[PDB]
Design a protein around this ligand. Sequence first.
Ligand SMILES: *[C@@H]1O[C@H](CO)[C@@H](O)[C@H](O)[C@H]1NC(C)=O
Ligand SMILES: *[C@@H]1O[C@H](CO)[C@@H](O)[C@H](O)[C@H]1NC(C)=O
Ligand SMILES: *[C@@H]1O[C@H](CO)[C@@H](O)[C@H](O)[C@H]1NC(C)=O
Ligand SMILES: *[C@@H]1O[C@H](CO)[C@@H](O)[C@H](O)[C@H]1NC(C)=O
Ligand SMILES: *[C@@H]1O[C@H](CO)[C@@H](O)[C@H](O)[C@H]1NC(C)=O
Lengths: 439, 439, 52
Amino acid sequence: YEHVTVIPNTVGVPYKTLVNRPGYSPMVLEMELQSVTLEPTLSLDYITCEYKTVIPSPYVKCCGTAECKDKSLPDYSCKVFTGVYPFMWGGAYCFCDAENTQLSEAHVEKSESCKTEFASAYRAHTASASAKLRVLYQGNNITVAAYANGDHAVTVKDAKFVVGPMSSAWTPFDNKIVVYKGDVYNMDYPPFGAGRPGQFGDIQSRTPESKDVYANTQLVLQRPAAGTVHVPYSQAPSGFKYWLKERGASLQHTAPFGCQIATNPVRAVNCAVGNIPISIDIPDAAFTRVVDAPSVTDMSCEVPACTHSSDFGGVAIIKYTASKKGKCAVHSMTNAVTIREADVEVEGNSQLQISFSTALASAEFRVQVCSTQVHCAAACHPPKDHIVNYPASHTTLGVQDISTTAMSWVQKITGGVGLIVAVAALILIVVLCVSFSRH
Amino acid sequence: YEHVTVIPNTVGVPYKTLVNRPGYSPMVLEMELQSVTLEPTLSLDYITCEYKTVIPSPYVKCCGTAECKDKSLPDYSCKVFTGVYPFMWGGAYCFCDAENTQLSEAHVEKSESCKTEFASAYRAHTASASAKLRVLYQGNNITVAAYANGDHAVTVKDAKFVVGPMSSAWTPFDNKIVVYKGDVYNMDYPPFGAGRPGQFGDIQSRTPESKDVYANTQLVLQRPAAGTVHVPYSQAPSGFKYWLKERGASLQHTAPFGCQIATNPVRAVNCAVGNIPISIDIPDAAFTRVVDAPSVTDMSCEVPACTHSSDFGGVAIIKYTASKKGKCAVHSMTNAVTIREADVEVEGNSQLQISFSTALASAEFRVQVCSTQVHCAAACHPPKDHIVNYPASHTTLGVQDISTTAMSWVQKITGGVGLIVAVAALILIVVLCVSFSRH
Amino acid sequence: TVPTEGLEVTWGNNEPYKYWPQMSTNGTAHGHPHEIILYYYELYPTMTVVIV
Ligand SMILES: *[C@@H]1O[C@H](CO)[C@@H](O)[C@H](O)[C@H]1NC(C)=O
Ligand SMILES: *[C@@H]1O[C@H](CO)[C@@H](O)[C@H](O)[C@H]1NC(C)=O
Ligand SMILES: *[C@@H]1O[C@H](CO)[C@@H](O)[C@H](O)[C@H]1NC(C)=O
Ligand SMILES: *[C@@H]1O[C@H](CO)[C@@H](O)[C@H](O)[C@H]1NC(C)=O
Ligand SMILES: *[C@@H]1O[C@H](CO)[C@@H](O)[C@H](O)[C@H]1NC(C)=O
């Protein structure tokens, strides 16, 4: 026996549905949603980290001319200077007082610390979905876990469940993201091989264990000062350090719809969009025949108090006459009023108590208890607190919902004005016929 | 200097482009495409293999009644029979001739061979692309390799190349594919947990190392024959074996556009769709000044033979007078004619020879050699071979390409008819003017 | 039949073959009028009839 329902995508509010099968007593179910998760598909592009500079000892050749050759190492440079005359702690270095030369060189490498401090760039694709549910079944709580599409089914206590697919495809991630120790940012990083001297991406590599390194920093050698031995240079500062000090707020604080974000692996949790269909299959062994359920013959309704607050602010008292002891289900027959209790116990001649919530100013609704109907009505008062810390447990109201007192005034006014038009219309018709016929 | 070009997606056909920079001699490049590869992103759903049935020894109890309890094993069954009287090789088993019973049970497991013979179901997503090229650069062959999108750049001999993106998003794979030892099929496999008794998907598991198995084969126990000890049963035969005997043709033999298929990893190669843009950055040191290149002052052209076949069926001879020894480029000024040679060497007073191919019935075109132009013309004959084994090396024709003799006949007929209208109209204009004036 | 885009044929366990068509005709593009029409008809049958 198949049954289909739809529940909105809100976490932490229960919902109820009615199953009615001819020949058997009605049964009422309750469901509550605990978590929804989305997970994208990722591919890696490159990583960045700090750099290091290597400078070997200078070569000083007096009374001679030096020269240097080219190499393939990244950012290699060599220069030759003339007219030097170094000093050391014991006196002058070389006997010659002229025609001295000095040779200098430097190149750029990758830092060792890159295995622990680094950032990674990714490409994003279509995401999957998963969900977790709590179901009240046969007087006990059971839990199910399944993928949110039509390609998965689970069996708990001889019942089949199918969840999904979802009604919306909205995702908070763009095409390009960058990840760093729990934070996710949206950023359009520069392409491979097209870095800049002082921004994100001056140094690039394909994986932390690769040996190929690309670098686009500036490196210019400068003339040494008189009487000293050293190798001065000019170079742009590191771009990875600057980003850490100016990166701003992450997605967890700016994302819409109230989503949460975790990074191992990258996930989005509890985004409230859309609704989810659900399908359930119930075996025949769970039903009870109508001949065995008790009957109820007389009913009445009395309501002592009503305040239309966000919580359960209603109370009702119902009287009954029952044939024999047993169980019965309770259900509301209107949409504006929700009832908390699902099952009640009945015996002999007694009364039962129920509670409800509603946003209507004037209440009128029907209650079904084991195949009978009862009518209740009341007037409700407004609350006194301005702000609460939880969402409402009832639906919104429409344009047709108006108090009984207000409706009466509208009827009298419209009726009165309509009569004046009606009486005046008849006089015109009588006169018009006389003119027509008499001529 | 930045240059942009567009190349059609055809393998095995060379193409040429012209680079023109004011103040310098022109340069000609040649490019040829060797391979293009597409690769999708995959995700595993479940696997299937063959099954085994386990039957423990029966239990025979004489002069009594037996019973059995429930268990959680897949496809478990138990039954009890009465009225049995088994025999063995030495005589009857038990003394009692009545009130005996027999108990039998069986269940289903996963075969050991699943580690070697299995099939796997995948779900596919958007694919990436890559390409490899050959370029003729300053008299040498160089090779490049890059991804077919705008996010990659490579440098070879101080030249920077960027390739992509592609003009089309066509892919030969659907959302659901099946892989088995080098073959790929398009198939809509059943949902997990919803198998069928005699088709693909009766046995399901999540990984070859998992312990959870779902089974939906039929198993019914039957009555033993008189005088024998055994456990007969009825069951539907394996669905995996059936699929192997009637699976049909693979994706390689049925796919369109001539694509080829490989499986480790899954790829598709050499699909002829769309076109690919290319951008190149040439350094300043590669150019030669106009004052250093030789000059050519006098030219004439003659064409001794032409046959408009799919190969290079033309020959041409050009006479020239040069100012000094040097090198020169050759490039065609029309789209319907292609010239194989890229450059020539010029000296003194001599002649040079070239070859060309075209689809025109009557050939007229211009040839440029080091900033001067010459006019050539000839007539062409049709070939005799009906079928060949290689594609054409020239472009298609339009409505404007018509033999010179055919155009002449069109002009005489159209002009002659038009004159008769022209003379007739003049008579009409005169007669009306006379009639207007006479009145 | 061999279409414009080509044909591929496989036989047993061997490698496939490839074929492409090539222009041929019994007419001529120079000479008398009735021989000019035949030349184009055998290459583009459908457009020749519509235009004429
Ligand atoms: C811990 O250190 C290892 C390398 O020693 C690194 O791979 C990993 O990312 C680090 N984890 C955290 C949370 O810092
Ligand atoms: C579990 O079932 C009991 C009834 O037996 C119910 O009162 C309780 O609320 C259920 N658990 C939760 C978390 O609602
Ligand atoms: C080779 O054997 C291993 C296990 O022994 C299996 O995983 C693999 O699929 C086999 N390959 C082929 C081509 O049969
Ligand atoms: C390499 O260059 C030569 C010209 O020097 C050319 O003939 C040859 O075809 C090129 N190689 C390939 C594989 O095309
Ligand atoms: C042309 O004439 C020859 C004469 O032998 C004939 O075989 C052929 O079918 C004709 N048509 C073509 C298109 O060659």
